[PDB]
Design a protein. Structure first.
Lengths: 362, 362, 73, 73
């Protein structure tokens, strides 16, 4: 019999690795961290100076956050939890608005992104957003291997292909990424359940660990040149370095940017400290059922520029350790799989911390 | 495909083991622990009676610590966070100064070592230290597979290779150790991340578990007779025994020696208990940016001699268990891999310890 | 293992014990089981036997195994 | 003193504040008072306004003065 039970060797397909299961192996390096080139292709036509994209969530990205992310070298994606006219107004506000790395189009204006669903109402929203000058559309769905999501992606590529870039929803397998690539998507977003606010892997018991999912999606997408975006489950800059090394071209950040000042919402004072609200788009409050997210609060951090600077410094240090001149070389790095004891050895241990580092906290 | 994902069987190169994942197997023994010989090679020409070295940290080793370590049978390495004239003065102070195991040169003077960086200013500091009477130069870096570190090691060995011994920076792979040996290093230090105060494996996500790294480095250094020093991650004398059995010849100690009276710094009182500062060299305060260390405090221990005696007693017990007359015989002991339950069983369990033992802390 | 022997004869398999979430039910059904039997998930409902218990202002209900000392007496 | 002022004219005196036991009420009535006004002795009953506070397995209720900062705001 099969060692794990039954007579079917393909019942348990594979062992899945996540960010905490692997470490990057140092290699022969001739690269100073300051000279590392952290530019990467977000889509087949858009290249960012910093490969970080803000999450399309109602407590993460709005006009201010989108403008700040575009100025810092990345991009912001406005959420679709607003009326269509309001979303178009936010797109116009971003496009209408020191920062040498800022992302700009052929007209010299900042780049913005918008998220739409699936359906005729979503089609009207997408048409309104495209008419307002949006550059990239995201078909933001929880299960992108559904036939409706693929049909919507094909429709958008057929209609507004010459003017915008269409990014498919979340996938976690090789077959889903291949289907999205065949459907005509310009970029594939990866991750089902690893988000810090998600309960999908608990409520439905469905998902896949992020590192293995990224590897599978890259094996499905790289021959066609389609970029891969790692979405959800990133907590440190080492996580971003690992996600890029596993094959992803861009990383989408949630809770790391929710505690910044540019994020929408009011500051909450609790017990002499500061926080702000963070919740999933599938949470009960956001969808007003069977929710697949939770509501919570993250500690307050400050300006987005400092956070992006620290994350980029960590990524530059990783590139220096691996000897990667560009991201295209960082994607050829190798991993070492570690156990739980190795995981606790990686973090600071046997020490009582008396002052916090800019890039680390418990 | 690969069970962890993708089509490349070499993406996840190996499975790394740390000190907590293995145990030493007992063997036929004719060795009394009190009759074991713990002498081991530091470099190709320097043999220590106690195979322990002190870390080059601004909270661990200064003149007093170097003198105490040399008297106890080991050696000290002065940190390079000091002005060049000040470090040369510390070297002269150590050389200017019951202890049957004390390590001394051919002129009856206590041995000492000093850490240098990479660069032309580092060259000036190294030449000053050599002219001031240092016994070994440690090219102290974080990534020794960089071209600059190898060039610096080659230059030092070409200039003052007949007067001093050159020890290369920290490596974590077989290729890096082979490159350091080819460059002309007298000894190779191993460990990138295991440090109790380090955050390199979190900020950059780069490293390797210590046991696998030591085995890989020994696989490249032993055929050429180059000693290997295990640096970082050691919390018990059993860890020292495991590191020696993996192939290392000496173990450099950090936090284990940072709480003794001979370590630089002042006593601190918190709720009737004694602590003292311990911070990483890549921490924010130490480099005064993207730090790769933290600042904290460790409980006060006392005289260095008692700590060294306890560690050597544990090592002698391990040598007696494995039937190793010498460290060279300990370097051929076998390992058994354990699970998390095995690690829980190795420590005291289902007990409420009421009095602290000299060699174990809960 | 049980489904590997029960499926050829058309005998259904019931997964009993250890289920704490709906994802666990989905995993049990996907492994070959046809139904799931629930314990503590339904022990705190209003329809289960037993009086309510109040601890620190919150509501609880008693739950014990049939092999427990009290239940086997 | 108040009773010395009020008794000849037949005006009753109400003792208000500081009572913690029934003996205190008896002492106040013996001193010349006619009735007693109770504070903390009735602030912990069910009929008193407020919500039960649960701490360390014991029940409390909130009690504050009208001159307190949180009651004058
Ligand atoms: N052993 C470790 O894992 C580790 C990690 C961080 C810091 N440290 C300690 O902190 C101090 C300073 O460390 P440092 O090495 O950054 O000193 P440093 O800034 O003086 O660097 C010296 C040389 O190391 C190499 N180097 C270091 N980090 C590199 C990277 N990320 N990518 C490429 N090359 C790199 C370069 O050749 C550089 O010129 C030392 O005392 C060191 O032991 C150690
Ligand atoms: C699960 N996942 C959810 C929900 N809303 C958004 N998301 C996903 O999480 C990502 C961010 O996760 P972090 O780990 O916090 O960075 C988002 O980009 C989105 O893909 C939800 O309700 N449940
Ligand atoms: C990471 N590692 C660092 C830093 N400064 C020094 N080190 C290394 O750690 C060792 C200490 O190990 P312990 O586990 O504390 O015994 C040192 O000897 C050195 O090699 C730093 O900032 N980050
Ligand atoms: C062990 N198992 C016992 C006992 N009484 C009943 N059971 C089993 O547990 C199931 C419920 O498990 P939950 O995880 O609580 O859902 C029951 O259906 C029964 O099969 C006992 O004393 N010991
Ligand atoms: C002082 N006295 C205050 C305040 N609010 C009310 N009072 C007086 O105290 C009586 C309560 O006495 P207990 O000892 O609690 O029985 C009240 O009846 C009232 O006369 C205040 O803020 N400061
Ligand atoms: K560490
Ligand atoms: K034990």
């Amino acid at each position: 019999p099969v060692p794990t039970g039954g007579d079917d060797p393909t019942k348990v397909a594979m062992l899945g690795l996540t960010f905490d299961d692997v470490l990057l192996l140092p290699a022969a390096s001739d690269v100073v961290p300051a000279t590392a080139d952290t530019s990467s292709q977000l889509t087949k036509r858009i290249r960012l100076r910093v490969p970080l994209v803000s999450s399309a969530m109602d407590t993460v990205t709005e006009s201010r956050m989108a403008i700040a992310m575009a100025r810092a070298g990345g991009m912001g994606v406005l959420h679709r939890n607003l009326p269509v006219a309001e979303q178009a107004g936010q797109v116009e506000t971003v496009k209408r608005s020191q920062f040498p790395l800022s992302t700009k189009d052929s007209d010299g204006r900042l780049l913005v992104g918008a998220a739409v669903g699936v359906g005729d109402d979503a089609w009207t929203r997408a048409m309104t957003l495209v008419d307002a000058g949006v550059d990239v559309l995201i078909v933001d769905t929880a299960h992108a291997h559904n036939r409706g999501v693929l049909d919507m992606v094909s429709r958008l590529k057929q209609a507004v292909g010459e003017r915008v870039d269409v990014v498919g929803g979340n996938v976690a397998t090789r077959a889903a990424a291949a289907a999205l690539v065949e459907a005509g998507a310009d970029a594939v977003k990866v991750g089902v359940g690893p988000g810090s606010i998600c309960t999908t892997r608990v409520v439905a018991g469905v998902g896949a660990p992020q590192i293995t999912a990224i590897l599978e999606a890259v094996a499905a997408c790289k021959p066609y040149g389609v970029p891969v975006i790692a979405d959800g489950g990133l907590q440190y800059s080492g996580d971003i370095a690992k996600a890029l090394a596993a094959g992803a071209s861009t990383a989408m950040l949630g809770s790391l940017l929710a505690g910044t000042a540019e994020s929408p919402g009011e500051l909450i004072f609790v017990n002499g400290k500061q926080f702000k609200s963070y919740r999933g788009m599938g949470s009960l409050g956001a969808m007003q059922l069977v929710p697949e997210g939770i509501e919570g609060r993250v500690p307050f951090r400050g300006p987005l520029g400092t956070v992006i600077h620290q994350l980029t410094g960590g990524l530059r240090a990783a590139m220096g350790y691996t000897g990667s001149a560009t991201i295209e070389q960082l994607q050829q790095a190798q991993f070492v799989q570690i156990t739980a004891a190795g995981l606790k050895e990686s973090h600071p241990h046997d020490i009582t911390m008396t002052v916090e580092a800019p890039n680390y906290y418990t």
